[PDB]
Design a protein around this nucleic acid. Structure first.
Lengths: 322, 322, 322, 322
DNA sequence: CCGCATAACTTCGTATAGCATACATTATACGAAGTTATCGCC
DNA sequence: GGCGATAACTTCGTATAATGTATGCTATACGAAGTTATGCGG
DNA sequence: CCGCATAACTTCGTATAGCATACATTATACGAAGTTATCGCC
DNA sequence: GGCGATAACTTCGTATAATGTATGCTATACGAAGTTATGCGG
């Protein structure tokens, strides 16, 4: 019917309305689905539920994780719903098979992993080693780690701080205005403070790098092999490069990583969120202050962060050890 | 369709259902929508989503703020709903457009602005600079600034104070009765007391102006070129004239505005509410005792006025600094 | 047509799902509407929108409060909705006339009233006066006032306490299990705790009256002219009687009621709820604790209580006047 | 209809989508419903609102709790949903009678119960009494009580522990790996640690029995009439036998159980979780640590276990008892 | 033995306030164009 | 004796920040007409 | 003076976490039949 | 050297307390293969 292609044309015409990341994986899963359908001589676009059942079981037999299969189903649902057709997931066969896979894989022992923490005694050790550095690169790296630990920002947000957003309170402390986030979108935005410690690091960076020459410059820039910094107003330092600061620092402290082929063997971009949330909850701050520090809306999100507190030093052990 | 004719007759029959400030805006929107439709040969009254798309993109290209565009769409919704026709915002296209617009403009870095504060040190300065004038206009202005800062009333509420509404308690403080409340549940209360210091200024005005000859007189009035007051029971100073008091007082101490054309280069009708709130929050006053004084009910705006005070640095700064 | 008869028969057959106050008010509204329709020779049940427009304009000319007219419309809406017919309020002709009446009456200065507060100093004064009375009537009244001030319950819930509901902590405080409330209804529920002093008053009353020797008696009961209690398990004090206790206690201190015929000239059953809330607000208790103590769901209700406070002692005068 | 036959066949094809505990209840509910429909001579499968109403009122006359009645309605709604029919809960009359039953039965004084708490004093007493014993069946029971109290694990997940899940730290404490988690995101984490004292018990049990001779053996097993232990790897000790340990040890101190026929007259499987919760609350451990320790995501349950402690008395008690 | 009359509550009706959740009006900011009641020269 | 100049304010239109009202039920406020037990002087 | 090297960062492709709102499935409690490995009394 | 009496559990059914998953979208993790400016043999 024409209305399907009309709706698809409308969805593509305002492609900017979705995230940059949401389009990438719609296409990625569409490749795999169409390839499997062709290999088995089945019509690929208007999916038939008894074929989707076979596809899901085939994905299970390959050994993919449950959240991968959740993604693979979720995009086909999105595509049909936005086309204006009934979802595949409305039929009982796929609805029950998804539960069956979840049950059997969880009973076999699969679980969700979590990033390796980065706690205050690590920040103190890194700072103790790096404080004497006169390299521009070390100044940049230490200032970044300071902002990351203090604000609990995402890496994607730290990549886009304009110089014009840096402002000062009545005293010495710095204030950063963040604007939109992964959830908030408004011109009122959120504003966050920095301690009398890390502002010396940020102000040293700004003074040495000279990014202050134009209010449209970004704070963070490429530093080349020569050691010169290349200020810019039109290109952002990639998140793929920001992860390398964490990896290089962990290698500096503990030496080289092994080839085991498992995730989270070293610090990664999420490590500072976890470590700050653990340090703050262990110190006994109240739930409302934790919520205001992190900016979450639902209190149970806190229980997703503090999951892996060290049982060998928790409340009951101290209580029974008298 | 004569049913629309009926619905319109039954709408403007009860036109007093809406503020005159609403009617002022609805016609200003319709003039622009009709002019654009005329220029582009579109049919103007029953809006088509493929027209509303193009019009919203034209407003974006003209550079209006996001909330101006939301105002423009809101009035078109109101006109359709009261006409009985399907609400244009319900269409799939225009919601995708609005999402694209706001996400683009927020990525361009638009930020909300806020009134310049008028603070205790300024009230002390203007007082010690002006209180010796015999010129009646100076007495009138110095009394107005005192009532404004002491009561946090909005200027449209201050313009309506009858001299009938003043009373004088046994301790000598003036009590101002609130004639017309803003809301059926008057969250601000019903009566406000002036300081002893301000009372002397208001008594100076009442004695000089002769306005106490009749209870129905308005407390504030125009002063002619001759330097003589003109009491009235039937007319009020325009709020436009009251804004001139703030402008002239700022111009008296500082220079003049830049040619930059930006808003909030000088004190304005909300400068007192902001400044008083910041003074209260800098002292020890509790959040609900602040919130009750100004008549707010949402936390958000009270936070938005105090966010940059060094009381509000939060739990992480407290942990880091000790 | 006659399916309406089935719908109404179902609504009547299960009517115990609704509070009896909701039926009592509905029948009075129907008597009013039917009497007016009979006076003007109109058909009464299916509410033609222009008829209810005439009826609302007739009510406004009697000078009834805005809340009364809202109630009169709200019951006719509910009667149509539950019958399975289009609401009369769905017409623009009715909702605009309501919006007009609301906005016009506020220009005449109408506002919602509030009960007279009963604060801590009054409680201490009454205890100082009555503590030594040997009349069991005084022991009862002083226990009732102590509970009502401590626990912030509605008097309709204080009338409902069984002797089964009373327990003690190991510290000797008393706990009252509330169960049902005006908004929360479950077999688990709220439990509230008295201070030591109020427990001494309650135990004094229990010991004197003997009500506690059978667990299913109610805690409060009538006392005859002779000064002897009459325990019961099947009847309880009217709320009218509990209001009489407040009014008599006010007349004990201030001697006589004014002849002016205004409402809220003396303490009434709501007086204690308002007073404790004000005492908490002046004490600087945080919003989450005030919310927990009152049991309210949403922060706006806090602002709905502290509407009235003494401006002549308020923060702004206290700050400006040193 | 063939659609029903196919939907039922699909529901049977994937039967592992639900726990066996869901199937058991669905069958008991269907037997009850079909028996009642047979006795009253009505068609039973395509259930009708009048029949569900009559059945619900029949269940109320047996005096079943309101949560049992809601369970009975729930399973019939599941059966209808998965059969692909409209469901009784969406109907009008069922929604009214569920209100009627709830409100009437709450006003009748129906009350929710809790487990009898097994607190630190009881564990110290039982240990001081039993620990001298040398017969294997006593050592088993004391080791089980120690693990249950220290870990807060539930009895079912305690039965699953294979001996290869035990491991030892260089601190001499014993760690238990959870194995199968309850949920994909394990709020309780992944590993539990025993205190030294409980480890001294477990080492005795694991050395007196032969269980350690194969890493696949279950940690607990039958002990026969002559004290011979019967280690196994295919079969695990039934939960019913685990409840017997709590009941028998209670009976050993407090004698014969009362005849009143109520629940919770003696300790049961939850007595340890409630006891350890209250023991932590007395020590002032903050709510986030208690919630992470026991794995609760909803604060309401932790609150319902600690209301009775006077530490939870509200701010009005602090204001009165200043 | 008696009739009476004061306490201390109960029942009834017409007015008015409270709650929790879901989504649209209502006011101020600024530049430009018009008043019309007094300073001034000549 | 006027014509002219000019303070101090009023009215208009487009741009942007702030605060509100509708639903669907639950309560309380007041006074007037009633009811059932004892105290008192016969 | 030219060519070759190598720090330091971009694109690209499959794989797994995080969120905020809305609505049911999963486990323990406890009578009471039923099983089987042994003592007990000849 | 045979029969029956006892633990010490196991399986079953119905009644009541407690914790869970689905949806729609946004982000991070990691290996691999380009890019492009400086360093420096000779």
């Amino acid at each position: 019917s024409d209305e399907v292609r009309k709706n698809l044309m409308d969805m593509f015409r305002d492609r900017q309305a979705f995230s940059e990341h949401t389009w990438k994986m719609l296409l990625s899963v569409c490749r795999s689905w169409a390839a499997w359908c062709k290999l088995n001589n089945r019509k690929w676009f208007p999916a038939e539920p008894e074929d989707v059942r076979d596809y899901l079981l085939y994905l299970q037999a390959r050994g993919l994780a449950v959240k991968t299969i959740q993604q693979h189903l979720g995009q086909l649902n999105m595509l049909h719903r936005r086309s204006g057709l009934p979802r595949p997931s409305d039929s009982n066969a796929v609805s029950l098979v998804m539960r069956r896979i979840r049950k059997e894989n969880v009973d076999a022992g699969e679980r969700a992993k979590q990033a390796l923490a980065f706690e205050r005694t690590d920040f103190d050790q890194v700072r103790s080693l790096m404080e004497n550095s006169d390299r521009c690169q070390d100044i940049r790296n230490l200032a970044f780690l300071g902002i990351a630990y203090n604000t609990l920002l995402r890496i994607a947000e730290i990549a886009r701080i304009r110089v014009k957003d840096i402002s000062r309170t009545d005293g010495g402390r710095m204030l950063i205005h963040i604007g939109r986030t992964a959830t908030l979108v408004s011109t009122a935005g959120v504003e966050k403070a920095l301690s009398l410690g890390v502002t010396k690091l940020v102000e040293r960076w700004i003074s040495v790098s000279g990014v202050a020459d134009d209010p449209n410059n970004y704070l963070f820039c490429r530093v080349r092999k020569n050691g010169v910094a290349a200020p810019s107003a039109t290109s952002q330092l990639s998140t793929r490069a920001l992860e390398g600061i964490f990896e290089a620092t962990h290698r500096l402290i503990y030496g080289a990583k092994d080839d085991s082929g498992q995730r989270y063997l070293a610090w990664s971009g999420h490590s500072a969120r976890v470590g700050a949330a653990r340090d703050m909850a262990r110190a006994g701050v109240s739930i409302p202050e934790i919520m205001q520090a992190g900016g979450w809306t639902n209190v149970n999100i806190v229980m997703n962060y503090i999951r892996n507190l060290d049982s060998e030093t928790g409340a009951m052990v101290r209580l029974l050890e008298d």
